[PDB]
Amino acid sequence: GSLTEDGLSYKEKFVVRSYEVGSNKTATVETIANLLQEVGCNHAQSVGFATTTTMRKLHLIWVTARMHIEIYKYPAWGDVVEIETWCQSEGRIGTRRDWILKDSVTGEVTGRATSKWVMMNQDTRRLQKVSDDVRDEYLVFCPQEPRLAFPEENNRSLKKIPKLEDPAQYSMIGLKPRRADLDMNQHVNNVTYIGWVLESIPQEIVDTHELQVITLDYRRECQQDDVVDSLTTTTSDSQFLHLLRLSGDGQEINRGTTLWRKK
Amino acid sequence: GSLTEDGLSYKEKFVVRSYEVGSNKTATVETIANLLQEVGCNHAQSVGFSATTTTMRKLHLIWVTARMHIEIYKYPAWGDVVEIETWCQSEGRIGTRRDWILKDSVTGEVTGRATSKWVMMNQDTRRLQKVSDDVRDEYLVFCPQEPRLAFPEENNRSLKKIPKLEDPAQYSMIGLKPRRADLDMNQHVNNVTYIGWVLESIPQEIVDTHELQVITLDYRRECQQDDVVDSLTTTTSNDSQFLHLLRLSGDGQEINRGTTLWRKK
Ligand SMILES: CN(CCO)c1ccccn1
Numbered sequence: 025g026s027l028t029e030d031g032l033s034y035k036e037k038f039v040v041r042s043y044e045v046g047s048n049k050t051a052t053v054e055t056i057a058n059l060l061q062e063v064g065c066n067h068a069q070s071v072g073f074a075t076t077t078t079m080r081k082l083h084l085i086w087v088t089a090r091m092h093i094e095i096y097k098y099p100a101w102g103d104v105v106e107i108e109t110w111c112q113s114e115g116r117i118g119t120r121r122d123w124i125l126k127d128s129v130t131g132e133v134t135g136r137a138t139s140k141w142v143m144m145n146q147d148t149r150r151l152q153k154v155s156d157d158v159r160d161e162y163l164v165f166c167p168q169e170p171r172l173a174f175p176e177e178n179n180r181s182l183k184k185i186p187k188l189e190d191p192a193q194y195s196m197i198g199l200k201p202r203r204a205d206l207d208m209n210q211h212v213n214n215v216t217y218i219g220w221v222l223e224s225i226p227q228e229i230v231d232t233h234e235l236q237v238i239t240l241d242y243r244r245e246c247q248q249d250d251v252v253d254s255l256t257t258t259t260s261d262s263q264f265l266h267l268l269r270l271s272g273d274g275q276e277i278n279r280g281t282t283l284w285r286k287k
Numbered sequence: 288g289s290l291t292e293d294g295l296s297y298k299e300k301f302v303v304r305s306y307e308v309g310s311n312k313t314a315t316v317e318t319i320a321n322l323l324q325e326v327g328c329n330h331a332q333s334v335g336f337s338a339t340t341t342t343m344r345k346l347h348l349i350w351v352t353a354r355m356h357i358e359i360y361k362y363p364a365w366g367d368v369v370e371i372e373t374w375c376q377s378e379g380r381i382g383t384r385r386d387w388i389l390k391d392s393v394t395g396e397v398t399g400r401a402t403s404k405w406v407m408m409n410q411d412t413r414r415l416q417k418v419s420d421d422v423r424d425e426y427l428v429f430c431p432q433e434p435r436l437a438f439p440e441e442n443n444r445s446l447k448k449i450p451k452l453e454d455p456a457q458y459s460m461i462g463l464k465p466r467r468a469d470l471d472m473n474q475h476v477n478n479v480t481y482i483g484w485v486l487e488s489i490p491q492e493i494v495d496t497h498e499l500q501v502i503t504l505d506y507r508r509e510c511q512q513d514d515v516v517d518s519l520t521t522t523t524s525n526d527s528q529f530l531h532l533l534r535l536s537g538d539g540q541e542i543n544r545g546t547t548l549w550r551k552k
């Protein structure tokens with residue numbers, strides 16, 4: 025992988041692995057989400073980071089508030105996918121990281137993603153607006169003019185998601201993370217939550233439809249010793265409303281929506 | 288990746304990914320095990336398999352793992368390049384064996400090794416069988432004819448008999464269930480998930496102060512997508528050794544047994 029000529033975006037190629045594909049012999053949405061994080065991490069490293077020097081002194085970190093992914097074609101096992109990523113400053117609200125997925129052979133866009141990140145104190149978990157001093161340290165690594173993976177007005181990536189009402193139509197209960205679900209800092213990887221949301225979709229839907237869009241809001245983290253319940257209700261193509269909550273007290277950890285197309 | 292000059296082994300390089308590493312910023316044993324399967328799959332494809340032979344598909348026969356044995360000297364760091372070489376050997380009518388050698392691409396030194404025993408089974412009835420002469424004759428041209436072992440040593444750990452853990456277990460992790468990410472393309476639980484489940488019953492303090500050096504895993508029966516598993520561990524021992532058992536939650540039917548050896552950091 026490498027930064028582009030202007031140094032304002034990053035590209036990387038990936039060959040889809042045998043264990044990364046589902047029953048259709050194409051990459052799962054969780055494989056795609058892992059590749060998005062990997063290219064984001066390689067971009068951060070290439071420009072010297074994704075905490076800045078001032079963020080480390082103030083014990084501040086970037087945390088994902090929202091992830092939105094749209095896939096037109098899932099790459100097949102053995103295929104090469106090219107992913108381009110960049111970041112944009114959203115004033116004092118936070119930052120946004122966008123991605124474009126392309127088939128390396130045809131050059132056509134096979135997917136796109138966007139994510140909203142907010143600043144929080146790593147110890148108290150208190151959210152904050154971005155200070156001028158921190159914002160000034162990362163603006164030189166972003167395109168100054170807007171560059172949006174989802175430009176269209178009133179697009180799915182900015183839609184408000186309601187809270188699922190009991191009783192849920194479908195559910196998968198008692199989900200727990202194992203060590204493979206944790207990142208290097210012993211926190212649950214963001215992609216595990218995507219997997220948990222999908223667990224409450226009936227197997228018949230997965231067997232006859234392809235996931236086209238997923239929007240996920242992240243409200244609170246699941247700890248290594250926490251247990252989660254995944255809830256789904258059909259709202260409709262098939263559309264679903266989702267909710268992940270702690271198994272005991274019912275504390276919301278995530279809410280989301282998925283859109284599926286018939287095969 | 289590519290077959291070597293003689294066409295009897297296969298090599299492939301991998302750059303360790305951010306989500307593939309643990310607390311020490313080095314590849315987990317599950318990442319290593321996934322890479323071993325990926326290079327095994329690429330080897331099978333390069334020589335024309337899909338790893339069933341033409342006669343195997345006719346008779347509805349498949350290769351299934353009976354035992355996996357991995358020894359790691361150094362886990363590659365995040366961003367490092369690891370080179371893995373793999374080959375297969377015929378073990379007469381008992382079955383086949385796939386071996387691996389892991390090397391640091393920069394230094395060229397061996398950082399790990401693995402060996403696995405595979406047996407033939409009817410895909411539908413699940414009945415094990417010896418390898419017939421006709422099937423064995425179709426894959427011998429893809430194997431070195433003289434023995435080539437990742438674990439040559441006379442009394443090496445890869446061939447040791449593993450006993451059955453007796454109740455009560457010292458440690459346990461109960462109610463483990465596979466999710467869709469744990470399944471392969473055929474909707475069967477991936478073999479690497481069982482390694483993860485075995486490791487779940489090791490206390491976090493051991494993981495935080497030791498490095499896993501060796502794991503030997505016997506595969507007795509598969510866990511189905513709707514099954515629930517209990518992972519049991521008892522210390523048997525500067526090194527710490529453990530005896531492991533995975534069994535179905537409910538009837539207590541054994542799915543795997545194994546041993547791990549850990550060294551102080
Ligand atoms: C806006 N950020 C995060 C700054 O902490 C970027 C920008 C480019 C590459 C990596 N991170």
Ligand SMILES: CN(CCO)c1ccccn1
Pocket residue numbers: 330331334336338339340350375376377383426429430
């Ligand atoms: C002995 N076998 C299994 C053939 O069913 C090999 C050998 C080389 C590559 C792949 N499979």
